[PDB]
Design a protein around this ligand. Sequence first.
Ligand SMILES: *[B-](O)(O)CNC(=O)c1ccccc1Cl
Ligand SMILES: *[B-](O)(O)CNC(=O)c1ccccc1Cl
Ligand SMILES: [Cl-]
Ligand SMILES: [Cl-]
Ligand SMILES: [Cl-]
Ligand SMILES: [Cl-]
Ligand SMILES: [Cl-]
Ligand SMILES: [Cl-]
Ligand SMILES: [Cl-]
Ligand SMILES: [Cl-]
Ligand SMILES: [Cl-]
Ligand SMILES: [Cl-]
Ligand SMILES: [Cl-]
Ligand SMILES: [Cl-]
Ligand SMILES: [Cl-]
Ligand SMILES: [Cl-]
Ligand SMILES: [Cl-]
Ligand SMILES: [Cl-]
Ligand SMILES: [Cl-]
Ligand SMILES: [Cl-]
Ligand code: NA
Ligand code: NA
Lengths: 467, 472
Amino acid sequence: SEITYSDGTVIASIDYLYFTTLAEAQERMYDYLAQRDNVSAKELKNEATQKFYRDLAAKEIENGGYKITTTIDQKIHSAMQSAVADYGYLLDDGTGRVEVGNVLMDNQTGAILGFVGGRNYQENQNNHAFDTKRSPASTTKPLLAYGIAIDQGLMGSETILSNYPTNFANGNPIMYANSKGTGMMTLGEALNYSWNIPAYWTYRMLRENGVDVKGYMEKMGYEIPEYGIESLPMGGGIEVTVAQHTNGYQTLANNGVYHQKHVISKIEAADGRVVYEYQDKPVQVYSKATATIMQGLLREVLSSRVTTTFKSNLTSLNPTLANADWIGKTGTTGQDENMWLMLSTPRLTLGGWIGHDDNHSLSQQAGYSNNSNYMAHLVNAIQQASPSIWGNERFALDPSVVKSEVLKSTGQKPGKVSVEGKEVEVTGSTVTSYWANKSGAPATSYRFAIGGSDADYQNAWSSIVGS
Amino acid sequence: SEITYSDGTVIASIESDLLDYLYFTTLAEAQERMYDYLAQRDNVSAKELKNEATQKFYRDLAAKEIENGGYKITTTIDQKIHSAMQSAVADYGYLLDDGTGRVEVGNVLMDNQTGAILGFVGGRNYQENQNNHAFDTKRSPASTTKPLLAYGIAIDQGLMGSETILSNYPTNFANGNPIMYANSKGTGMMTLGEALNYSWNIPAYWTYRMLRENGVDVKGYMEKMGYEIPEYGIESLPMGGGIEVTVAQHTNGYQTLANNGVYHQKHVISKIEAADGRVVYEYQDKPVQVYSKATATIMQGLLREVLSSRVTTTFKSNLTSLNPTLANADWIGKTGTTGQDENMWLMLSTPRLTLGGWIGHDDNHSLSQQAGYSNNSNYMAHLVNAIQQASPSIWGNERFALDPSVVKSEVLKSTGQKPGKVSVEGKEVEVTGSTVTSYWANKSGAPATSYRFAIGGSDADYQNAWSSIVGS
Ligand SMILES: *[B-](O)(O)CNC(=O)c1ccccc1Cl
Ligand SMILES: *[B-](O)(O)CNC(=O)c1ccccc1Cl
Ligand SMILES: [Cl-]
Ligand SMILES: [Cl-]
Ligand SMILES: [Cl-]
Ligand SMILES: [Cl-]
Ligand SMILES: [Cl-]
Ligand SMILES: [Cl-]
Ligand SMILES: [Cl-]
Ligand SMILES: [Cl-]
Ligand SMILES: [Cl-]
Ligand SMILES: [Cl-]
Ligand SMILES: [Cl-]
Ligand SMILES: [Cl-]
Ligand SMILES: [Cl-]
Ligand SMILES: [Cl-]
Ligand SMILES: [Cl-]
Ligand SMILES: [Cl-]
Ligand SMILES: [Cl-]
Ligand SMILES: [Cl-]
Ligand code: NA
Ligand code: NA
């Protein structure tokens, strides 16, 4: 039995590359054998059956004469190994040795071209790309809060949300770093800064409208045991591998269309019948309008440089590659335990995590600076190895996107609002807001933003009233 | 006659003209030193020397003396470094072109302890454009003025400390126009750290306004650093309004802050000696304490955060990517941007060196929006690295640190002054809250909180501020 690269080159006969691809090879054989023997999912639920079928899948691979075709690009995977050997030291920050996981994924197929499993398989065998699960934190926000709210037509690109101080149900303040919050802001600013309260209100709105949020997340392969959590949009109650989470940003980057992640393409018996072949099941999870609007937002998350120095780092390493159409989002857990940076061009998504195996804190700036700088170095290694793999294509608004002229101040169409009895003529600076519904944005009404108390609205309307 | 590098290697021999940047700059300055020495030797008075045909005669005589004579001219120019600077601009200059044309450039590397100029960049390519953008060009230093003319003086005079609050509330010039910053009429109260990081304008306006109300001799300070500003009675002076400088002079103001407040006059010539042994000129060390050590070291701490905040420069990010270990040196700096983005400045120091940097167009037209935020910052990280590669210890590993004379005060985040009770317009109030350490350069430290706790701000501003404070 043999395991090969995408081109056919032998990886090995039956150091992360071996164990990862063999393991997935095995899971594939497992499904196949259980299918071959008509084991129902009840018996499959059973633990000693599980052990038996696992063992049988493994021997079937050793004893069989199987050709196992992987999706791994040798040059690219190899360059990624070198990148982490050469530049992994950039992660270490005086909190101990910082572990890393990266998965490089073709956005149009979901194939995985290469990955980084950890700083050094010899030193530490944990596989941080495929096995370790950590809260994805704020990188949850585009997928589960904002993207869904837009796809449902509850929100456009320049909609306003409350970042006024507010409490969880226990009465503790919702915090972001040191801040209890500020006031109204646009989706764009909420996203660039990664504020927490606007995300809380958004998911709260989705529950109020009874939106099938599980539907969305499950179509991307996400398994979240409990959706009834106030901090869910922030990453609370969620734990994901780098591979699975990469698959989510693949969905946004591929114009809303999911392709299931995979590292095994084909398994052929000695006589050459396919025991397993990868079967494309493209799923439209977000509308093309919603995914393309989200792309324009996530472009500016990087551009703005508020929570990541990535675009600066990359410019200094390779100004040409800095000009590809990068979009992305960062994540940071509450005690700086885990940092994420997810990056896409139209062709590829590169998911990246860092943290400690025992879950203890990183440095304040581990995500903003170190992982950003390490990931720029990695992206540049992938380029050198395979020089047009990223592409210079641009993300663009889908024709079905609807434009609205809204007031900058309310994110809604200008007109008459009643403000404590005195009805007023809301006028002023306007912007183009992008929506994914039919009618675009509504007329401005008193409760114009996502979230906010009465005290907040009093206060906010006061400022707008300074006409 | 020969001009050499600091180590004695010959840059060039000087011959009469028939009828790069490095040659003409050093020659032009050698000539200025010979001018001084000839007027001297002939006892011409500096009033006699205001006679204009007399400038001409003594300038021509100084040119001739060098041409004819057998003079050894020792410059301060470090050959490997200067050479690395010329390669860096040739290799990375293109990073400055942003779509508005051929972006010109001036850089001056200075030793903070002596004022010696180790190297410079005169421009993009002497053979295409001979204008010397390091020594000749004068442009507004824009916001890079603020630490020198506004905040550093106010701290020095005891009128403000590291965590003093200043107004950024909307305010007008005397002519009724709003003071603008980018596109913003302003915000509210903010710390000195925030005013400096974002480079707001209203806090500098109020700072200079204070200095003027106090009768502070701002001119005294600036002139001790060699700055020539014809009119100090300008509202926007602390933003760079009514100031034009060369990169060499302006690098010298930053050298003064970096050197714990002690100015050394910039120079490119260290010695002229004749074949017979006469030393016709030798650089005389003349250190001047322009700001106190407490002020300069306080200012150093704030300028460290200007760069690390990355608000108006990507520099520390660019440099981290090029050379992480070099990025860990103790960098401090300030950016400048003129109103229409005509001119971008970035000034950088470690304890050992100051590197000034300007970009812009010879004809003064606009650069792109991010020319200084990103392009200059990235080109200068490349320059700082090339200097490093040429001379790996030259930037040094020393840290900037508070002088012992600095006075520390425990102060309210919200007011910048000691906690206590305040006349909040009938209803005496007890001000409590978040505490921070504030550094002062005086004897006594910060005040107890007064009603008017900030630099600047109207009656209505203070109603607004105090209302929001009290809400605890
Ligand atoms: B975001 O990563 O910028 C901020 N996220 C959080 O604060 C978050 C992360 C994990 C669990 C819960 C929360 Cl609120
Ligand atoms: B600073 O460069 O960030 C802001 N400075 C200016 O706005 C300025 C520049 C030159 C002349 C006058 C002004 Cl206000
Ligand atoms: Cl590997
Ligand atoms: Cl391959
Ligand atoms: Cl809580
Ligand atoms: Cl749900
Ligand atoms: Cl999952
Ligand atoms: Cl639920
Ligand atoms: Cl697979
Ligand atoms: Cl950018
Ligand atoms: Cl609709
Ligand atoms: Cl030169
Ligand atoms: Cl004066
Ligand atoms: Cl001057
Ligand atoms: Cl005056
Ligand atoms: Cl000189
Ligand atoms: Cl002689
Ligand atoms: Cl830093
Ligand atoms: Cl940056
Ligand atoms: Cl005190
Ligand atoms: Na984040
Ligand atoms: Na500036």
